[PDB]
Amino acid sequence: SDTKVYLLDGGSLVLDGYHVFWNRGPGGEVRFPVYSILIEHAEGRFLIDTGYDYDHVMKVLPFEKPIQEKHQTIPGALGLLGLEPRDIDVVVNSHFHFDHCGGNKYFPHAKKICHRSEVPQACNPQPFEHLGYSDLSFSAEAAEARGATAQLLEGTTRANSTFEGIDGDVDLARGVKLISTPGHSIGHYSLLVEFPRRKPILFTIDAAYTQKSLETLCQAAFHIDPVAGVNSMRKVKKLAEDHGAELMYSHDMDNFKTYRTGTQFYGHHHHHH
Amino acid sequence: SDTKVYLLDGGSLVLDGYHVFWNRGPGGEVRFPVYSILIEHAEGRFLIDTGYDYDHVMKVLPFEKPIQEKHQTIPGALGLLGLEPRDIDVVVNSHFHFDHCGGNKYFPHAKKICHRSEVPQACNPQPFEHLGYSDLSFSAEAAEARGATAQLLEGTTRANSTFEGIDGDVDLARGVKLISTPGHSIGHYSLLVEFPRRKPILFTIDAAYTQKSLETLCQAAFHIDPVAGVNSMRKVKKLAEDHGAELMYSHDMDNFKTYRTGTQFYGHHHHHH
Ligand SMILES: [Cl-]
Ligand SMILES: [Cl-]
Ligand SMILES: [Zn+2]
Ligand SMILES: [Zn+2]
Numbered sequence: 001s002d003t004k005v006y007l008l009d010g011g012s013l014v015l016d017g018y019h020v021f022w023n024r025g026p027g028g029e030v031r032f033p034v035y036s037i038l039i040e041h042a043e044g045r046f047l048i049d050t051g052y053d054y055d056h057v058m059k060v061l062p063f064e065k066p067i068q069e070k071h072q073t074i075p076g077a078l079g080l081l082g083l084e085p086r087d088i089d090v091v092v093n094s095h096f097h098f099d100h101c102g103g104n105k106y107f108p109h110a111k112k113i114c115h116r117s118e119v120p121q122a123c124n125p126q127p128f129e130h131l132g133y134s135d136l137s138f139s140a141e142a143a144e145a146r147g148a149t150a151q152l153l154e155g156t157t158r159a160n161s162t163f164e165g166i167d168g169d170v171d172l173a174r175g176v177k178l179i180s181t182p183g184h185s186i187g188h189y190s191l192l193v194e195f196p197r198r199k200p201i202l203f204t205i206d207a208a209y210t211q212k213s214l215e216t217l218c219q220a221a222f223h224i225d226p227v228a229g230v231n232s233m234r235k236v237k238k239l240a241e242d243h244g245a246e247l248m249y250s251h252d253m254d255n256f257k258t259y260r261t262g263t264q265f266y267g268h269h270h271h272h273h
Numbered sequence: 274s275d276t277k278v279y280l281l282d283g284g285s286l287v288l289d290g291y292h293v294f295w296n297r298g299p300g301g302e303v304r305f306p307v308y309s310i311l312i313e314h315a316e317g318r319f320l321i322d323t324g325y326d327y328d329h330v331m332k333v334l335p336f337e338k339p340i341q342e343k344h345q346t347i348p349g350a351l352g353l354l355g356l357e358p359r360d361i362d363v364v365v366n367s368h369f370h371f372d373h374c375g376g377n378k379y380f381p382h383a384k385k386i387c388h389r390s391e392v393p394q395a396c397n398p399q400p401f402e403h404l405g406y407s408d409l410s411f412s413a414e415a416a417e418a419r420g421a422t423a424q425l426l427e428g429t430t431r432a433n434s435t436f437e438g439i440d441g442d443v444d445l446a447r448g449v450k451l452i453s454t455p456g457h458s459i460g461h462y463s464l465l466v467e468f469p470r471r472k473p474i475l476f477t478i479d480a481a482y483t484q485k486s487l488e489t490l491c492q493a494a495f496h497i498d499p500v501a502g503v504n505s506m507r508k509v510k511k512l513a514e515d516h517g518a519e520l521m522y523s524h525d526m527d528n529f530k531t532y533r534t535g536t537q538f539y540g541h542h543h544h545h546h
């Protein structure tokens with residue numbers, strides 16, 4: 001069956017404008033959305049990222065003032081589509097900052113995929129990365145390494161939280177490509193989805209928070225290598241041009257309000273014939 | 274004659290707390306001092322850094338709300354000591370962000386020294402570095418490369434604005450060591466001054482803006498490589514321990530108010546014998 005993309009609306013968080021636009025700002029509170037990307041594909045149901053865990057943010061990062069209603073948890077968002085976590089075959093994480101892996105705990109049955117460097121980074125991050133990598137409930141191994149086993153959902157084991165590590169640009173499935181875009185994090189991935197009858201979508205994820213971020217090459221203040229970060233923005237600019245792909249950003253409220261979420265999706269049949 | 278250090282008070286600038294403490298903040302306007310370090314040495318008078326140019330900041334970065342009185346320009350500060358720019362034999366720049374090289378224009382006669390990578394960086398900086406490297410009046414070559422020859426003081430030539438490039442930890446003079454501390458910028462240098470009868474001083478310069486910055490390994494948001502930036506903070510922590518050196522920070526108002534400036538200096542005779 002034809003590839004469809006559903007965006008799982010995961011509520012919102014707040015940072016300073018200086019967090020969102022490194023050094024440029026302007027300052028002041030900025031609320032931004034968090035979402036995950038569900039692909040219904042011939043080869044299976046693939047979930048890219050799993051949003052944030054509300055209790056985690058309220059305990060560890062309450063200054064981010066999370067707003068997330070019951071339909072904006074991963075199980076809640078899947079429920080809107082008549083699905084449950086057990087329906088997802090593969091979970092892919094762009095990276096393991098807390099706002100992209102907070103729902104992994106619900107998928108012990110799924111195959112898990114991430115960049116090869118990301119699990120080791122969560123186990124032993126740079127000192128300035130501890131708060132980004134603060135939810136280790138996605139990995140028994142990383143939780144153990146970080147002294148955070150108390151975060152683990154009951155039933156989580158090393159066996160059911162082991163990732164297949166990947167590297168470079170790689171095909172997840174037919175017309176679904178993971179685009180290596182490191183800098184924001186050591187193994188950060190963006191996502192390119194191709195369709196049978198509409199143009200590709202390039203999900204920048206955290207390689208570019210907002211359209212303005214890309215336009216100005218002003219990345220987020222959270223990064224491990226801002227030189228890599230800029231080069232990954234250029235890679236994204238070009239890949240979208242070269243593919244005629246449409247760009248969708250991770251944490252851009254104005255743009256997010258134009259995005260289909262919930263039961264609305266990308267990849268409609270055309271009724272041409 | 275015995276080594277003496279005079280701090281040239283160069284007024285102040287404002288940034289957001291998020292600029293000063295990368296990602297940690299808190300936010301809000303923070304005013305911080307800018308100073309240069311004059312060493313009266315047997316081998317000559319060495320000036321490390323030259324503060325900011327007031328007209329440059331008011332034209333290019335007015336949001337930094339510069340305050341600088343006439344005795345806080347480099348000629349003004351030297352005047353407090355009965356000196357003029359012509360009295361300085363060697364100018365060393367820690368790096369070429371505008372707040373450390375704005376007074377170089379006054380020293381065409383002096384030998385100039387900087388890290389080998391810093392002039393090329395000013396000529397062609399990373400896109401996110403353009404505003405840090407925004408005053409090119411210290412170099413005819415860099416001004417030309419950046420389309421900024423209008424910034425040049427009359428009489429400035431390639432001949433009299435050429436630097437001797439250095440690399441690694443190197444002795445500028447007896448008991449004066451330039452400590453390589455890259456990360457904040459590609460060729461950033463800190464400074465260690467040893468005396469005949471008091472403990473060394475390690476001037477962190479921009480490797481650590483404030484005491485709190487060092488204590489928490491929270492560097493400034495302005496950097497090119499934050500991994501290098503942390504490692505340079507560790508190098509500074511250790512070198513100070515190993516030397517029993519006293520730490521002095523670049524942009525720390527609370528600490529700066531305890532520092533000797535103007536006619537007060539470090540390196541007094543002890544009257545013991
Ligand atoms: Cl569509
Ligand atoms: Cl003294
Ligand atoms: Zn992130
Ligand atoms: Zn994110």
Ligand SMILES: [Zn+2]
Binds near residue numbers: 370
């Ligand atoms: Zn600097």
Ligand SMILES: [Zn+2]
Binds near residue numbers: 479523524
């Ligand atoms: Zn500075």
